[PDB]
Structure 1
Amino acid sequence: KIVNIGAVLSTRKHEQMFREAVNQANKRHGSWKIQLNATSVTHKPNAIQMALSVCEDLISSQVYAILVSHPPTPNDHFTPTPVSYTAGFYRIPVLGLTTRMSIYSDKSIHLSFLRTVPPYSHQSSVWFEMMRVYSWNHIILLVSDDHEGRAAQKRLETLLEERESKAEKVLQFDPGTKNVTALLMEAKELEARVIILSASEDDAATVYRAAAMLNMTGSGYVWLVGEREISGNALRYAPDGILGLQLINGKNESAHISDAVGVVAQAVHELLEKENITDPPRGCVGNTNIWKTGPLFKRVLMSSKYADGVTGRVEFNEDGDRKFANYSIMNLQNRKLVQVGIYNGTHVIPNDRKIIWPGGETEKPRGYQMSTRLKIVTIHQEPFVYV
């Protein structure tokens, strides 16, 4: 009959072009009887009542996939979760965007969630090779102790295991620390100067101020910093030589709006085979059984190679994540985000401008200071070491 797919959007103004985009399905594969319809409603202001407007609105509309976008307000993952809980009960495949969290990447609770936006977890992968061409060997990392912090750490150690074995000394602290510089006393004790931070949006202010008190950001040091500690308040009171990152196609909902439809529309055509094509259950007044080819539909979405839109690299791994994303290496040059290169999966640096490392040093400071003081351990052996 008609292929109608659900979606939830931040503003009704964002739904105006969405209807137009799906109305161009004529110049697509097949175009026999496909009739795409928006079937979308603006998200509820409160996540408690939004589940009350999907059971009788989206499920009752015979939808197959739902696209979820970040709410305009800086909510703390309030919106993305209930949709997966609602959709996951019916096992209907659901794919979203602008979800930069590592909690949606596991199938223990979120069995079906395919985000076309790379997570913060994979951001630590670029640091492994970013310092490889800069000739850096030993590093230390200050990581916040929460679900997000540990997610990046387990990845980084595995990547670094085959190149430089272990890191030097991983440091952890509670997410709500305040005036705790105890873990910074050994910061100037491991002769590293490659401090890597993956804190929260607001914790970056506390650490940067703390390091300023011990002149830790002077000459000779380098910093590698994640995206979260550049945007927002974290930019204020920051070291003069950060090498933090950003995102190119992020924060642009319309960029993935067209890409999502193209993948879904192409997926609908491939579903047409000789096997079962049973539709999902209609309505939610009474429904217990789950359509069998629902899980199969997710696998079809997994094997979708969309060669259009963002340079034709809409590809997913064994989990639903964007691939070959570009982060566009940023920098800080006297209160200015001066881009000094790019990244596209393989690191080649178009060295625009010149790098000003912390302290104003023109040449890249190697982080290593071998110590001439050693601690030596001996035990009581009568002919060898008396006491």
Structure 2
Amino acid sequence: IVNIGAVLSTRKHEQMFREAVNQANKRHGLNATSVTHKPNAIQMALSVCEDLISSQVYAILVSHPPTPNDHFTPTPVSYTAGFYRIPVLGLTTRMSIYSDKSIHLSFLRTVPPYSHQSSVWFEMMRVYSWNHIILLVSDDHEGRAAQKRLETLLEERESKAEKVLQFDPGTKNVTALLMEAKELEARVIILSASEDDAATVYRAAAMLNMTGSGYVWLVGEREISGNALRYAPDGILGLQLINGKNESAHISDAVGVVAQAVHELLEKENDPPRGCVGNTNIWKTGPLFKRVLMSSKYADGVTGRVEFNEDGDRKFANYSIMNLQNRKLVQVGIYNGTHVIPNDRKIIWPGGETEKPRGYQMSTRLKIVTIHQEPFVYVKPTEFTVNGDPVKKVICTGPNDTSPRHTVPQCCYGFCIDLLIKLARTMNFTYEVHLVADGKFGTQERVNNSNKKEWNGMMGELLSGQADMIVAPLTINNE
């Protein structure tokens, strides 16, 4: 006989869960119990400790109650399970902090977290090949985990994003970052934030021309909910779990996985401790059960095969890609594990673009930094040629007087100036001409208070993106 338990306050799913586990025991390859979700977290911890003292629970099952309690519900039971290194599983754990092995290592997520949702987004990028991607994610631990996962995946793909936008939850005037990122050449924006944060950022974007042509945002499941859907511009892409918020299917899959795990455990030739009270020391068999659970897996469940990762999270899980057509999340794609399937080719972009807009946004304000080289760049503080033709001495600011640091506009005219004006006449590109304060080309120099060698001067500024391109008598070198 194996004593197992689950946590759920529906008061009706307990009977179906018991029937499912009994059927799994009869077929696959033992008494079960259920715990109601206590309102108070301390009360829930006391109840779970009492249950563990009374019953030597091998693994607990936890899901978010229908009443929205955010992340308060699963913390006490997760801490109790991790105290004795008891490998337990959750159902609706969409947060990546539980996936972390720091404190909640004893938690197995039957569903991929929100951070993993960013991964398919890169595949979403591969759907349309729009490398001009920017990130607008709230400065949250789960948000930071999603951002770093996306950064690692793009580094593997060698496709650097345009930038990243961090907004503290609950803060207003988020239009500052929106305007600071609007001028960039990116046309597709990746966002992931809480429901209130999502609604705030959608309202801010709609406030100042951020939903027009060349504007599109893809967000996770948590963002597409509540009144944010009403405030969401039409055509905004979203991702949802393939199983949705279906508790019965998750319960059946978890029952099958637990049956497989206990069938594998029964083969072990070498028990839970003496409850929450008395036996302070953890059970030596707890780590062994966790290891065999990592080794074991679930195949051909109610929602298909559920193959947990090294952290105990289902891999290649399907998802539904929805588009906000006619103010409804119409079915437009299926992310089958890893493969995109455009079930309905009726995607209308938020800017009213029936076609797929290019991820690149046209830019003409070409910023050119220069270095004062008299044969190439004649600079005079603020005339005609020998033949009387006018000299194109354009206005060029940036020199801080004597390198007390007075940036003054001067007249620039020379070889590089002639070349750049000829270009601007050729392909019709506007230009903003400026100089560099350091007055050096630059090199890889391990400067003070630095770890490695960093490019300096004009090349350093160009690498940093200060100027669009360098127009100077520069020697071609592979460095």
Residues 260 and 351 (structure 1 numbering): CA distance in 2 closer, same or farther, change over 3 Å?
A: closer
Distance 1:318 1:210 in 2: 40
> Quick one: which of 290, 308, 333 aligns to 2:325?
333
Q: The residue matched to 2:50 in structure 1 has which SS?
A: coil
Q: The residue matched to 1:142 in structure 2 has which SS?
A: strand
Q: Is the 8 A contact 1:145 1:172 kept in 2?
A: yes
> How many aligned residue pairs are there?
378
Distance 2:163 2:317 in 1: 30
Distance 1:26 1:110 in 2: 28
Instruction: String of CA shifts for 1:294-331, please: whole Å, max 9, x gaps.
Output: 11111111122322224542111110212221211100
Q: Is the 8 A contact 2:319 2:334 kept in 1?
A: yes
Cα distance, 1:82 vs structure 2: 0.8
1:307 aligns with 2:299: yes
Cα distance, 1:133 vs structure 2: 2.4
Greater shift in the superposed pair: 227-236 or 363-372: 363-372
Distance 1:204 1:178 in 2: 12
Cα distance, 1:120 vs structure 2: 0.2
Q: Is the 8 A contact 1:6 1:58 kept in 2?
A: no
Cα distance, 1:99 vs structure 2: 0.8
Distance 2:353 2:180 in 1: 24
Cα distance, 1:274 vs structure 2: 6.0
Q: Is the 8 A contact 1:138 1:164 kept in 2?
A: no
Cα distance, 1:353 vs structure 2: 4.7
Residues 228 and 274 (structure 1 numbering): CA distance in 2 closer, same or farther, change over 3 Å?
A: closer
Cα distance, 1:26 vs structure 2: 5.1
Q: Is the 8 A contact 1:61 1:283 kept in 2?
A: yes
Q: Is the 8 A contact 2:237 2:322 kept in 1?
A: yes
Cα distance, 1:382 vs structure 2: 5.6
Q: The residue matched to 2:332 in structure 1 has which SS?
A: coil
Cα distance, 1:237 vs structure 2: 1.5
1:26 aligns with 2:21: no
Instruction: String of CA shifts for 1:61-112, please: whole Å, max 9, x gaps.
Output: 1111001111221112111111121111111211111011111112221130
Q: Is the 8 A contact 1:263 1:301 kept in 2?
A: no
Distance 1:311 1:99 in 2: 17
Cα distance, 1:335 vs structure 2: 1.1
> Quick one: which of 53, 75, 81 aligns to 1:59?
53
Residues 249 and 243 (structure 1 numbering): CA distance in 2 closer, same or farther, change over 3 Å?
A: same
Residues 213 and 6 (structure 1 numbering): CA distance in 2 closer, same or farther, change over 3 Å?
A: same
Q: Which has the higher strand share?
A: 2
Q: For residue 16 of structure 1, what is the aligned residue in structure 2?
A: 15
Distance 1:365 1:202 in 2: 29
Residues 285 and 359 (structure 1 numbering): CA distance in 2 closer, same or farther, change over 3 Å?
A: closer
Residues 132 and 288 (structure 1 numbering): CA distance in 2 closer, same or farther, change over 3 Å?
A: same
Cα distance, 1:284 vs structure 2: 3.1
Distance 2:136 2:142 in 1: 13
Distance 1:176 1:26 in 2: 48
Q: The residue matched to 1:143 in structure 2 has which SS?
A: strand
Cα distance, 1:58 vs structure 2: 2.9
Residues 108 and 381 (structure 1 numbering): CA distance in 2 closer, same or farther, change over 3 Å?
A: same
Cα distance, 1:39 vs structure 2: 2.0
Cα distance, 1:50 vs structure 2: 1.0
Greater shift in the superposed pair: 283-292 or 239-248: 283-292
Q: The residue matched to 1:176 in structure 2 has which SS?
A: coil
Q: Is the 8 A contact 2:214 2:351 kept in 1?
A: yes
Distance 1:303 1:366 in 2: 45
Instruction: String of CA shifts for 1:110-141, please: whole Å, max 9, x gaps.
Output: 13000101100100000101121212121111
Residues 192 and 3 (structure 1 numbering): CA distance in 2 closer, same or farther, change over 3 Å?
A: same
Residues 57 and 314 (structure 1 numbering): CA distance in 2 closer, same or farther, change over 3 Å?
A: same
Cα distance, 1:7 vs structure 2: 1.2
Cα distance, 1:290 vs structure 2: 2.5
Cα distance, 1:24 vs structure 2: 2.3
Cα distance, 1:269 vs structure 2: 2.2
Q: Is the 8 A contact 1:304 1:315 kept in 2?
A: no
Gaps of 5+ in 2: 379-479
**Larger Rg computed on CA atoms:** 2
Residues 264 and 369 (structure 1 numbering): CA distance in 2 closer, same or farther, change over 3 Å?
A: closer
Q: The residue matched to 1:103 in structure 2 has which SS?
A: helix
Instruction: String of CA shifts for 1:135-177, please: whole Å, max 9, x gaps.
Output: 2121111111121221111111111113343211111111121
Q: For residue 316 of structure 1, what is the aligned residue in structure 2?
A: 308
1:182 aligns with 2:176: yes
Residues 349 and 282 (structure 1 numbering): CA distance in 2 closer, same or farther, change over 3 Å?
A: same
For 1:184-199, list aligned pairs within 5 A. Answer: 184-199=178-193
Q: The residue matched to 1:229 in structure 2 has which SS?
A: coil
Cα distance, 1:381 vs structure 2: 4.8
Q: For residue 81 of structure 2, what is the aligned residue in structure 1?
A: 87
